[PDB]
């Protein structure tokens, strides 16, 4: 004895990035990896005069990885791998909430959502050489445009665990990024050196629409 | 008869009252 | 693990 029900409610998504930098063993002129890493965030906002607490996990896929070769001497500046996101790539945002509307996202008929767009811009990162002038990687920007939503549940032995996923499409914007003291020719994208530019969070606001099968 | 080629199973666009399905 | 992708009122399932 079941029934279908509709929920039209607002949503705010607050998230941020993370990274991982490592160096290679030796005299100290060569870097090994400048890559991305997932990040978590916890916050509290109000809809309809009621406080809700939510959580967010941000990851990435489809990543373009670059390189630079300064020479073969022991004192040459070599970056073995740094990676950007540009125009053929996706960024993934998980989301779950404290409301009574997420108690009914078990058996879902349909789900759609209208969201704003946000721009993520880059910062700066000094490559610290022990002798000589330091190079620096600076710039970059992309914009995030929405895509579909995915619900996935996982059947282990103990208890079911499910998660909800927002997908986003990218489009490159200005300014370009550059590395100094080298020959990299002013490319586009958002690298993983200083991705969230000293800010506390990014923010996307919108509204969704959920139809689900509930007991009666 | 009608748009999207599905059409009482409900009142949505994609329900039978077929392009995708069995 | 069962996932479902919602594109234009049609479920796109995978196992």
């Amino acid at each position, epitope marked *: 004895l079941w029934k279908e029900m*509709q929920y039209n409610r607002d949503i705010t998504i607050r998230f941020k990035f993370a990274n991982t930098i490592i160096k290679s063993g030796g005299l100290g002129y060569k870097w090994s990896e400048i890559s991305f890493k997932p990040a978590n965030y916890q916050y509290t906002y109000t809809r309809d005069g009621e406080e809700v607490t939510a959580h967010t996990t941000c990851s990435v896929n489809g990543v373009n990885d670059f390189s630079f070769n300064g020479g073969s001497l022991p004192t040459d500046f070599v970056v073995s791998k740094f990676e950007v996101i540009k125009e053929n790539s996706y960024v993934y945002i998980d989301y779950w909430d404290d409301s009574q509307a997420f108690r009914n996202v078990v058996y879902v008929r349909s789900l759609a959502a*209208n*969201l704003n767009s946000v721009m993520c811009t880059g910062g700066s990162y000094n490559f610290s050489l022990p002798v000589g002038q330091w190079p620096v990687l600076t710039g970059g920007a992309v914009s995030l445009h929405s895509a579909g939503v995915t619900l996935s549940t996982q059947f282990t032995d103990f208890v079911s665990l499910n998660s909800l996923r927002f997908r986003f499409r990218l489009a490159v914007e200005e300014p370009h990024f550059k590395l100094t003291r080298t020959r990299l020719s002013r490319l586009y994208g958002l690298p993983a050196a200083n991705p969230n530019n000293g800010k506390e969070y990014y923010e996307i606001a919108g*509204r969704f*629409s959920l139809i689900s099968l509930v007991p009666s | 008869s*009608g*748009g999207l080629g599905y059409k009482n199973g409900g009142s949505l*666009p994609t329900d039978f009252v077929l392009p995708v399905g069995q | 693990t069962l996932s479902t992708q919602f594109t234009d*009122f049609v479920s796109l399932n995978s196992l």
Partner: antibody, heavy 114, light 107 residues
């Protein structure tokens, strides 16, 4: 891409109202349509919105009067508003949603005399 | 139901000059304000989608800036075609709320 309004133009108080917004150049199963109005000497006000699938969001003050529905085969969206008074005299528009609430393309607009 | 208030109702300018139009929001709207243009005998048209992002088919002399509660709108050079009334919108919460309206006058 165009939007075209049509209505009576003149009506007695405490009566009904029926306006049809005929769309062209896009489909009503991929985009969503707004309704707004502007009284004489007033700013623009928001009335309603119908989603891609048939589902509506309404204004809180005018919730118990109006209803929005659409036809997908013959591409049109119609509006109804009953128990009208001398305050409801305005020019009604129909617009298309682009992002969250950005009003991208606009209609020609019909006026209502009471 | 965020109230969006505009301070002035009329502006005056020469055949080439800079124009400044502002409006304030009641609560904190994180950089989500649109701008519109309705010429007489016409329908409105969207110009600036976000707080600073221009639209595709817009002349270059239009620009916008501001965040938080204060939001401004500027024009670099005036024309004879630029006589209209201008509006600022709020697209952060559930009812979208327009402003009062500021009319430009040719002097």
């Amino acid at each position: 891409v165009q939007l075209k309004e049509s209505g009576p133009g003149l009506v007695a108080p405490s009566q009904s109202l029926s306006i049809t917004c005929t769309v062209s150049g896009f489909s009503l199963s991929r985009y969503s349509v707004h309704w707004v109005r502007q009284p004489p000497g007033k700013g623009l006000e928001w009335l309603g919105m119908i989603w891609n699938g048939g589902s509506t969001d309404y204004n809180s003050a005018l919730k118990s009067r109006l209803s929005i529905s659409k036809d997908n085969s013959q591409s049109q969206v119609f509006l109804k508003l009953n128990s009208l008074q001398t305050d409801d005299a305005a020019i009604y528009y129909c617009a298309r949603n682009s992002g969250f609430d950005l009003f991208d393309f606009w209609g020609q607009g019909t006026t209502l005399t009471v | 139901d965020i109230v969006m208030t505009q301070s002035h109702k009329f502006m005056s300018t020469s055949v080439g000059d800079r124009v400044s139009i502002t409006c304030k929001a009641s609560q904190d709207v994180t950089s989500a304000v649109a701008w519109y243009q309705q010429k007489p005998g016409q329908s409105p048209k969207l110009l600036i989608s976000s707080a600073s992002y221009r639209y595709t088919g817009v002349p270059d002399r239009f620009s916008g800036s501001g965040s938080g509660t204060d939001f401004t709108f500027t024009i670099s050079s005036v024309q004879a075609e630029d006589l209209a009334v201008y509006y600022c919108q709020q697209h952060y919460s559930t009812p979208p709320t327009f402003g009062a309206g500021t009319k430009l006058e040719l002097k």
